[PDB]
Every structure is written in structure tokens, then in C-alpha cells.
Amino acid sequence: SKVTTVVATPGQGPDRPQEVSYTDTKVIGNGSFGVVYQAKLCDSGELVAIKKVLQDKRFKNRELQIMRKLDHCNIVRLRYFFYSKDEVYLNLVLDYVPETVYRVARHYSRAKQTLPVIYVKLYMYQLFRSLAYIHSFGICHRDIKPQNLLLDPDTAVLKLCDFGSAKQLVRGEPNVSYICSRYYRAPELIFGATDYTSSIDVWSAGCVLAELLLGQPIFPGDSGVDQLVEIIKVLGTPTREQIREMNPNYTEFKFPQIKAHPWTKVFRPRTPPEAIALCSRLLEYTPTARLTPLEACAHSFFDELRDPNVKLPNGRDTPALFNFTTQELSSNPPLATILIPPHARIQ
Ligand SMILES: CN(C)c1nc2ccc1CCCCn1cc(c3ccccc31)C1=C(C(=O)NC1=O)c1cn(c3ccccc13)CCC2
């Protein structure tokens, strides 16, 4: 009962500090992403995660200012923030969730068992949703992978986190190319591309999809150089025309020609055709040929989720999949027809 008490500015509301108290401060993480503690809210009893960073007093913060314009239930909610190695740290109080998709995938795999397809449908849909909400701002995550997909096991609700790498993409302004974890890095980035679009999130989510079908990473590779070699094995060698689309700085190739290994004989035998059809639309050399998140939500692979008489393996109802705002449908309103099925329109 060693209660810390600070004054903290609410995350999405108006700029009006309150008093807040909590306890049970133990460390849960410490790495590239920063320094995170678990903690317990005195009043409610609820759990939280608290990220801590030395902040350059004379400057804004790119992570804080991105999270303060966000309120989506597939995105980890920022509750409060405040300040406090010698001088000035920034603190962010976040919703706590104990399991991840990576952890859950890992368990099925090492025991030599496949992830039931229903869980594959649930997880990607909610991800594509989460991508659609941020892409309607210009904000690109730039670190989609299974370890950044938090998950409630009993309910199935899933929440993207870690907006440390996230950035608002602007036409004409250059951006760094060595970014995202290697196995989930789009080929344009590899090629040196500097004015890439938010469709790099869509590539990465494709790599996550295939992983959940095979029970292991689709493109490993043992270096930044070897990562395009593992890709080429599957999609063959790209054309000068494809290489132009990714980066207009390459004219001559540096690695012999290979032909495309077909999609059907990459996975196992019983795999559903729409999983494979979808996967082909995500993993394309050409950025503009890849689907949009919202278009991905409307794929025929997710039709089972829009059934009314559908439940989880533990009997329960599925979480709400059809409470789309206008902001969320804003990039293509016509799709409402499909995204919201009849029974979810009940006046
Ligand atoms: C094993 N393991 C190393 C691991 N790594 C990650 C995710 C989960 C896990 C295991 C689950 C244990 C519970 N667990 C939940 C965590 C968390 C954070 C650190 C350690 C454990 C942890 C949470 C978050 C978050 O936003 N809200 C959370 O509740 C964040 C995840 N990250 C960042 C970064 C910056 C700010 C907040 C958070 C990125 C790290 C990726």
C-alpha cells in the first residue's frame, strides 16, 4: 500500500488535470520500446501499463500527440499522461491487457497443432479495422507484427499497441526506409524507398496472416540483404516495371532470375481458398495493387463473422464487429452495405 499520487492530464478530453493515485508498481518490460510498469488504480481496482521516457524539455513528443487524437476499441486507450535520470520524464497511463497474439500462436505451434481458422478470422478483421481508423488520418504504424497485437483470451477482443514508430505521412516529405521488424518488412523499404505510403502496414498484416496458417514466419532471412531472397523464392523475381513502382532508383538487378512458386503449394492441403485469395491481394510487389484495410474487411474470407447464429468455441457471443462510425467508413461509404449486415441495422 505505497500509494503514489500525481496530477494527470486526460488523454482524449479537454486539457484539465485531475488527481490520480495508484500502487503495486512493478516492472513488466524494458527494451527498445522504452520502460513499462504494471500498476493498479486505487479507486477502481483496474490495471494499467505506464511507459516512462526521458523527454527533451524543449520539444513536443511524437507518440503522445498521435495517441491523444485516438479513441477506438481495437486500439489501446491512453487514459492520462503526466511528468516527473535527474530531470524531466514523460509518463503515459494505458489500458492493461495480459496476453498477445504472438504468445497464443506460439503455444499451438510448438505443440504441433494449427490455430483454428475461426480465431484467424476474428484477429485479422479486428486488425484491418484498427488500420482503417488510423489510415483515415495519415498516421501509419510502421511496426505491425504479432508481438504488437494484444489479446483478451476469454472474450477474443484484440488491441493494437506500441505507437512508438508511428508517423503521419505527408506527400513530398521523405521518411527513413530501414524500419519495421525484418520478417514483416515490405520490399519497397528494402529497395530504399523514401516516399512510401501507409500500404506498408497492409503488407505487414499479410505476413501475419500467412504466419497464422503455416505456424511459422513466411519470410525469415538471416540479414537485411537475405530478407528479399526469401521473398523472391515465393513471388519470383520482380520485373523492372515492378521494381520501378517500388523505387525509381533501380535500373539493373543484382541477383539471378527466379520464377514464382505458386500459392496453392505453399500452404498445407486443407487450407481454405479465400484465405489464400486474400493473402495474394496483400502480398503484391506493387503497392497500389494491395487492398485497403476496409476493402480487406469486406473480403469473402470473413463472411462467417457476419453470420447471426455464430459463436466462439467457448459458446459466447463474438465482440461487436459492426459498430462503424462515419469517420471509419469515410474513405469508402458505399461499403457500409456489406460491412453492416441486415441484423446489425436494427432500429
Ligand atoms: C513478452 N513480451 C516481451 C511482450 N512484448 C510486447 C507485448 C506483449 C508482451 C507480453 C505480454 C505481457 C503483458 N504486457 C502488456 C503490455 C506490455 C508492455 C511491456 C511488457 C509486457 C506487456 C502493454 C503494452 C500496452 O500498450 N498496454 C499493455 O498492457 C505495450 C506493449 N508494447 C509497448 C510499448 C510501449 C508502451 C506500451 C506497450 C510493446 C512490447 C511488445
UniProtKB/Swiss-Prot annotation:
Keywords annotated in UniProt: ADP-ribosylation, Alzheimer disease, ATP-binding, Biological rhythms, Carbohydrate metabolism, Cell membrane, Cytoplasm, Developmental protein, Diabetes mellitus, Differentiation, Glycogen metabolism, Kinase, Lipoprotein, Membrane, Neurogenesis, Nucleotide-binding, Nucleus, Palmitate, Phosphoprotein, Serine/threonine-protein kinase, Signal transduction inhibitor, Transferase, Wnt signaling pathway
Localization per Swiss-Prot or TrEMBL: Cytoplasm; Nucleus; Cell membrane
Annotated ATP binding sites: I28, G29, N30, G31, S32, F33, G34, V35, V36, K51
Keyword Lipoprotein found: yes
Top EC class, one word: transferase
Modified residues (Phosphotyrosine): Y178
GO cellular component: axon; beta-catenin destruction complex; centrosome; cytoplasm; cytosol; dendrite; glutamatergic synapse; mitochondrion
Annotated phenotype, changing L90A: Abolishes activity toward AXIN1
Active site: D143 (proton acceptor)
Predominant subcellular localization, coarse grouping: cytoplasm
GO MF terms, alphabetically ordered: ATP binding; beta-catenin binding; dynactin binding; kinase activity; NF-kappaB binding; p53 binding; protease binding; protein kinase A catalytic subunit binding
Tissue-specific expression: Expressed in testis, thymus, prostate and ovary and weakly expressed in lung, brain and kidney. Colocalizes with EIF2AK2/PKR and TAU in the Alzheimer disease (AD) brain.
Function: Constitutively active protein kinase that acts as a negative regulator in the hormonal control of glucose homeostasis, Wnt signaling and regulation of transcription factors and microtubules, by phosphorylating and inactivating glycogen synthase (GYS1 or GYS2), EIF2B, CTNNB1/beta-catenin, APC, AXIN1, DPYSL2/CRMP2, JUN, NFATC1/NFATC, MAPT/TAU and MACF1. Requires primed phosphorylation of the majority of its substrates. In skeletal muscle, contributes to insulin regulation of glycogen synthesis by phosphorylating and inhibiting GYS1 activity and hence glycogen synthesis.
Family (UniProt): Belongs to the protein kinase superfamily. CMGC Ser/Thr protein kinase family. GSK-3 subfamily.
Protein name: Glycogen synthase kinase-3 beta
Origin species: Homo sapiens (Human)
Gene: GSK3B
Coverage span on the entire protein: 35 to 385 of 420
